Amino acid sequence: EVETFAFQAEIAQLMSLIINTFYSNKEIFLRELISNSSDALDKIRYESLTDPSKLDSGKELHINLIPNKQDRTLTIVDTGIGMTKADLINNLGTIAKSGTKAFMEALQAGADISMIGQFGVGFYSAYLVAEKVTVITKHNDDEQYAWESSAGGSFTVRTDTGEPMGRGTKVILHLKEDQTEYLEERRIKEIVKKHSQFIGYPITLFVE
Ligand SMILES: *[SH](=O)(O)c1cccc(CNCCCn2c(Sc3cc4c(cc3I)OCO4)nc3c(N)ncnc32)c1
Numbered sequence: 001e002v003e004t005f006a007f008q009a010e011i012a013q014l015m016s017l018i019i020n021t022f023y024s025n026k027e028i029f030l031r032e033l034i035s036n037s038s039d040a041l042d043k044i045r046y047e048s049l050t051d052p053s054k055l056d057s058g059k060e061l062h063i064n065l066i067p068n069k070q071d072r073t074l075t076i077v078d079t080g081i082g083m084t085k086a087d088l089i090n091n092l093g094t095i096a097k098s099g100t101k102a103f104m105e106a107l108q109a110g111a112d113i114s115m116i117g118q119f120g121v122g123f124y125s126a127y128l129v130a131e132k133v134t135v136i137t138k139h140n141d142d143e144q145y146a147w148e149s150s151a152g153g154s155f156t157v158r159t160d161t162g163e164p165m166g167r168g169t170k171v172i173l174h175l176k177e178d179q180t181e182y183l184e185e186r187r188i189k190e191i192v193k194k195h196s197q198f199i200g201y202p203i204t205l206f207v208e
Helices: 009-020 029-049 085-108 113-119 122-126 177-183 185-195
Strands: 003-006 063-068 073-078 130-138 144-149 155-158 168-175 204-205
Touching: 003 009, 009 063, 009 085, 009 122, 029 063, 029 113, 029 122, 029 168, 029 185, 063 130, 063 177, 063 185, 073 113, 085 113, 085 144, 085 155, 113 122, 168 177, 185 204
Parallel strands: 063 204
Antiparallel strands: 003 155, 063 073, 073 168, 130 144, 130 168, 144 155
16 A cells, blocks of 8 residues: 655755756765764664663664666665654654755855755755655664655655565665766765765675
């Protein structure tokens, strides 16, 4: 069963801006997604200090970057806190609305798209390089969900019946046809070294 939802107008506008604005520095999407994973790993780690059973779903805290040229996907996998259905449908949109407003105001004052993470909406930078984004996520006391959007004003959520993850999030970037450089080992390594070199969890770049 697949549920279809409308983005808030402000978030649809942000996604359109990211898709339509001419901006060549697209590589910053990876820093934003790795930062989000690092934050999620920080969160499960700190919560586990007062409730160690929150790691029953997996003790290892890490990030995997998995390119697949057959599928034309780049996947960012973490074993962080994960997201609930309530996050996916309601709560993330609440903070994304205020963050988008501040980001738009900063852009009008001369800021550039690379500062998007300062406004809490860095996830949507995925649409600099992806025509579709699928997010598989599992939070401790909730089901495994698949979120998906090709923009256009809507997203879907369904219960995921794929390989169980234990706990964490996979962001699957279905790359635009002209953005396949982000499947190349040398290019991904270059970007991680430039923008994500002090992340406090192992980042494993898979090879194909
Ligand atoms: S906690 O609950 O005290 C707490 C403290 C501070 C902040 C938060 C809220 N964190 C939300 C993180 C969401 N998120 C992201 S970004 C993101 C992902 C997706 C959408 C929108 C956004 I904005 O729509 C679909 O997916 N990336 C995350 C990862 N990798 N893991 C967990 N949470 C993530 C809570």
